[PDB]
Design a protein around this ligand. Structure first.
Ligand SMILES: Cc1cc2c(cc1C)N(C[C@H](O)[C@H](O)[C@H](O)COP(=O)(O)O)c1[nH]c(=O)[nH]c(=O)c1N2
Ligand SMILES: Cc1cc2c(cc1C)N(C[C@H](O)[C@H](O)[C@H](O)COP(=O)(O)O)c1[nH]c(=O)[nH]c(=O)c1N2
Ligand SMILES: Cc1cc2c(cc1C)N(C[C@H](O)[C@H](O)[C@H](O)COP(=O)(O)O)c1[nH]c(=O)[nH]c(=O)c1N2
Ligand SMILES: Cc1cc2c(cc1C)N(C[C@H](O)[C@H](O)[C@H](O)COP(=O)(O)O)c1[nH]c(=O)[nH]c(=O)c1N2
Ligand SMILES: C=C(C)CCOP(=O)(O)OP(=O)(O)O
Ligand SMILES: C=C(C)CCOP(=O)(O)OP(=O)(O)O
Ligand SMILES: C=C(C)CCOP(=O)(O)OP(=O)(O)O
Ligand SMILES: C=C(C)CCOP(=O)(O)OP(=O)(O)O
Ligand SMILES: [Mg+2]
Ligand SMILES: [Mg+2]
Ligand SMILES: [Mg+2]
Ligand SMILES: [Mg+2]
Lengths: 364, 364, 364, 364
């Protein structure tokens, strides 16, 4: 029945109107500067990059989504075998469901069976930390899929509107996370869930030892909208209130700038609303080390293995086109390519004290 | 006559299209920065605050609306008994009608019968001060409902277009107000009525001893529109002129910044177009001490006691959501939470010499 | 057959869609700040002002329009007797047509018969000066209506697209104008015709002794559009080209700022798209000494004497409402009232080197 | 078969919806300051200018388009004879086709037969330079039409999406172009193809001896869109990806600023979306020495000789109207006329470090 929520999440995300609903990534305010003399050939473009101790083929990851029941495992299986084929990292959805129910384990474990080489990323929610999870649950989440890192998700906006939500984010949870990180043999990434990471949140996590961030900004999947729908469906009055919050959060573009600026040495996944290899290029150019995606991967996976393979060819082709067209022979060159920032993202950055000169230098 | 106007005001406000008609609060240029790690739990959020010598449950008030006839008292009764239940302050509509006609008194006094503990705020119009009111009329408006404060309304835009309006705002009125304040045993609040308080107006009032303000800016009920409609109804030619003034006034968000900036120690109600607990949180984060609402409370009261209780539950939920999602454990924390100011509001503040650095410290 | 042009002009302005066509005044970027405590009563508002050696009742003028044939005279007669009634100045249309044909004289002279006391303003085009008019033609235009001033119009944009247009603006004409002005017993005003006066044009005229300006900016009557329509009517190919120029010119608001900034001691009519007393109040607040109107006066005059009387009552009411609601007891106070400049107008002024600080000192 | 591409190119450009598709020149952010007193007569405006060693009648050129087959030749013939009649320069389409196929030569050579006096500009693609072209190919393209210059085109965006495209832009090609330019008896112009020249690209080319640039920015013919359409037609999957890149590139107005700013002594053609003589005036005012056009000349030429003659009368009329209305007696005066830059173009220039003060001095 946490199982039911897992199913409902997929169903609404895949089939209802929640992608970018009343929200915006601010990526339209980011322009990559065209170079009519690139100085390179398309074929020499190198998209290889580091993901902790592994090498990955493309600076893109699939971020965590699902697991909990056997038809969710079959979706995981499809994503995983394509991810493995393409050499891209994959996170799984929250594994709480499997900690609570042993029959749910196999829908996660299937990932590692079919993708023995790529980084795989475990997932647990911050609220479970204030509610009694500790080391053991972490190591269990990790060994279940022989994970290379574990993501801990921030979802307070979701929890607030979720019919059976748990909005508990007491400071003690970070004391615990920091102790646990002592004992883990893989790194921790803190990721959001559609509402983005701000400078204050980034600096607070950093002060507890967190070095790896996944922006999951607003503009992509709208998790407040998903829970709103689940509220309409139950006739739960929170639904009209969630409607007033549909545009709540830090936009992806702004969150990439905020995290890069306030924690210049972070390893940074720029995600929330990444829908094309152009978006992924902008995310990286702006300051991310890698671009994350979830929803469009889900929708293709549902359509099948070949649809998902095609989706990835397309993303990769687009990313490379953007590198071609900015004269960027590799990922490091894209991270320093010339951009223009306009409109509302410019005004956000200015109001937040983001000095563009030092910004430019920090993103590189 | 005056009673007919009182009923027509309610009916037009309640049932015609005047809410935000060709006007704007500028609150869409205000963004509360999401914090994916709040550092608190939902259940620990504290919404209590000061309202002069009383404590109120939530930093929200219902501002003055009606009174004058028995069906208007029945609306006052509904508002008052729900306000009392939720522990929130309530102002009554202009009591001039009851000063002029003893049969109108009971439609005010009913408020205190059903709401013995909450702050109750009296109401008189500034024009009546240039036209012969003084101490006695103030003390009467007060004792009629054993008020904890009295509001004096500014409504020159309304009076200019009102068919039987009285646009008299001689400086002598403030000389009188200040002398009256000497002798009153409750504080005075000066409030506008849909057209907002500017820095020059705030400073001028302050120079006469007024320390309590209620912005009532444009963007919510449009009182120029209400009178325009009364003019169309009478075939009074002022109607076409009112139409040219529909967007006249200081937008609520700009008025909050102006007052807090030019009178930093003010006690400040941010109102005019507050329609959700998100709007209330914005008003407060921007500089108000409390958020005020009138029209949506009127529309729900008309639907009934249960509709209005539901309305309040919703507003409070929303407010707390916004506190949750900004890491604000209490109202003082919300007053200092991180914001972003964009677009037209930003341009307003810059043109008006509102130095943002100093704005920040003053709102805190 | 210039007389045909004269009638076509009135016909197209009055009945085709040329008012504000693809053009803008920039007055929506100017806000007058609302003062909830005006410090005055409506009844004490004084709209009187100076118009050269006369006193006028309201800071508004009717700018020049027509004359040429007897039905045009009957329009002039209607405008003139209402203008006299209200104590406002009136300019006539270009009198070239009456210099060229004696039968046209009476359609101008009729103005002075029916309006013995108000300022009356003669009119001649600049191109006639380059092409041979001199002193005598000026004095004849003047005596024909016992004018208190003569306007010389700048219409190169019009002349460029006008089928029989004369786009001759050789610098010599200004030498002549200056010599003429030596010998005239009444002042010269230089006015545009829908395309506005720039700082360069204003400083150039000033260097030749011109101190009185009428901005006639874009946003109101679009004379390029009028000529485009006359071009379509003749199947003259200039019509398509005129279409590309529909938004050509300095917007009225930007023209007011430019002229007041570059010639601080000018006597300044702000006109072009003034359609309401609020527009007239903005124009003055921004820097003009008086607001001018032509098209809407033309349209009401056609409908008749009483419709035009009503038109003026409305304008005057509107102007005074703006004064009331900014706390401006008189015209000099309105010239110093608080404003906000936003958006495109702001970006215009910044780009053109209009230092806002010095701007505010200079308009007062 | 390259010949098929040549035909399809013309056919899609002339008859599909690709002019300004999802793209923008930014020319609407550029305003020419109207001068109500021009100081000149229309008839004295002088549009003569230099094009390398020749004089041309008007500061406009037709940029290269087509050639390859005899119906393409007949379009080249029409353009050429009108170009000759009006005294304007004409570039031809990429002559690769005629290097590869002797039967395609005559469709280029026809240009010189019918236009013995005007400047004629040859055309080759940068990618053919990385892939083996050298001096001889350059000299053949030149002698084939007795060219006065040869344009080399930058089209990586196009090549990336083109079904049979060749996205090779290795730095070596510039070493070769530099050596070739040693040996050529005519100058080289480097032009883009709808995606614009940036300051990095311009400075790089300059460092290799290139002093003549043709911006061909975004906002006019969208070459990504043309290839996208060829991809739809073949069912090539690159189509959906092209669609994500529709708004890729430097807008014409920004490109002109960037090239003029970064290479102040460049000879500069401003092109890409020039559709009227007002556009042409803006491009020159902003920094270009000449305005270039392709697509609308193609569409008129297809309709016939008289339609193209009319097209040019109209452009020239428009150009001269903009000169008249800015008080510009000649091209040098238009280069230094007063402008206003707003909106996104302003923000582009600011973000890219284009100091407007120095920009003004350099543009003049
Ligand atoms: C079906 C579904 C289910 C979930 C997710 C998403 C989707 C679409 N996401 C959030 C996801 O990882 C990502 O942060 C956001 O969806 C933003 O990225 P997109 O806009 O979806 O590309 C998510 N996040 C996480 O940390 N734990 C989880 O269990 C889930 N569950
Ligand atoms: C039916 C009605 C009647 C009145 C009002 C409003 C309404 C809706 N308001 C103005 C009100 O207190 C408030 O300042 C504005 O209406 C702006 O807030 P809202 O946008 O309505 O929340 C009001 N204010 C006041 O000072 N004296 C009055 O008697 C009235 N009367
Ligand atoms: C019918 C008609 C005819 C004329 C005009 C206008 C109208 C509508 N205008 C221009 C007018 O005085 C004014 O400068 C512009 O029309 C801008 O003001 P409005 O937008 O019309 O208020 C005018 N101006 C002028 O100086 N001499 C003229 O003869 C004319 N003719
Ligand atoms: C049908 C057709 C075909 C070509 C072109 C254009 C058109 C419409 N253009 C690009 C052209 O010269 C110009 O740079 C762009 O089209 C932008 O100008 P417009 O927006 O078309 O005015 C072009 N450029 C070039 O250098 N070599 C070429 O062979 C072609 N071919
Ligand atoms: C987008 C995400 C973070 C969805 C998971 O939310 P849940 O709140 O349903 O996750 P668990 O409680 O099962 O950890
Ligand atoms: C919005 C407001 C302030 C309504 C009161 O206006 P009135 O002008 O009808 O109030 P009184 O004259 O009865 O004081
Ligand atoms: C807006 C104006 C100036 C209308 C008069 O234009 P014309 O060019 O027809 O006037 P004259 O030649 O008769 O002076
Ligand atoms: C806008 C341009 C550059 C059209 C010609 O491109 P092509 O790519 O077809 O030209 P070639 O390969 O024939 O040189
Ligand atoms: Mg949860
Ligand atoms: Mg009143
Ligand atoms: Mg004329
Ligand atoms: Mg090619």
């Amino acid at each position: 029945d946490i199982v039911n929520r897992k199913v409902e999440h997929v169903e609404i995300a895949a089939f209802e109107n929640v992608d970018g609903l009343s929200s915006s990534t601010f990526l339209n305010d980011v322009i990559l500067v065209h170079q009519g003399f690139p100085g390179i050939s398309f074929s020499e473009i190198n998209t290889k990059t580091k993901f902790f101790r592994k090498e990955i083929s493309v600076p893109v990851m699939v971020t965590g989504m699902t697991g909990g029941r056997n038809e969710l495992g079959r979706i995981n299986k499809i994503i995983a075998e394509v991810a493995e084929k393409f050499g891209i990292p994959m996170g799984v959805g929250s594994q709480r469901v499997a900690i609570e129910k042993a029959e749910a384990r196999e829908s996660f474990a299937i990932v590692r069976k079919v993708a023995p080489t790529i980084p795989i990323i475990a997932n647990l929610g911050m609220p479970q930390l204030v509610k009694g999870y500790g080391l053991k649950e972490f190591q269990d989440a990790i060994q279940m899929i022989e994970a290379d890192a574990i993501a801990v998700h921030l979802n307070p906006a979701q929890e607030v509107f979720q019919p059976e939500g748990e909005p508990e984010y007491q400071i003690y949870a970070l004391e615990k996370l920091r102790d646990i990180s002592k004992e883990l043999s893989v790194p921790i990434i803190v990721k959001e869930s559609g509402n983005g990471i701000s400078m204050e949140t980034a600096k607070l996590l950093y002060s507890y030892g967190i070095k790896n961030f996944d922006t999951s900004g607003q503009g992509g999947t709208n998790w407040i909208a998903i829970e709103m729908i689940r509220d309409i469906r139950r006739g739960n009055w929170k639904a009209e209130s969630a409607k007033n919050f549909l545009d709540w959060g830090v936009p992806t573009a702004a969150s990439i700038m905020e995290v890069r600026y306030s924690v210049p040495d972070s390893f940074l996944v720029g995600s929330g609303g990444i829908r094309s290899g152009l978006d992924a290029a902008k995310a990286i150019a702006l300051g991310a080390d890698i671009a994350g995606m979830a929803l469009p991967v889900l929708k293709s996976a549902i359509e099948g293995k070949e649809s998902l393979e095609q989706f990835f060819r397309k993303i990769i082709f687009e990313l490379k086109a953007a590198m071609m067209l900015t004269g960027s022979k590799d990922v490091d060159a894209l991270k320093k390519t010339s951009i223009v920032i306009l409109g509302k993202l410019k005004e956000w950055a200015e109001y937040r004290g983001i000095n563009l000169s030092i910004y430019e230098k920090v993103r590189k």
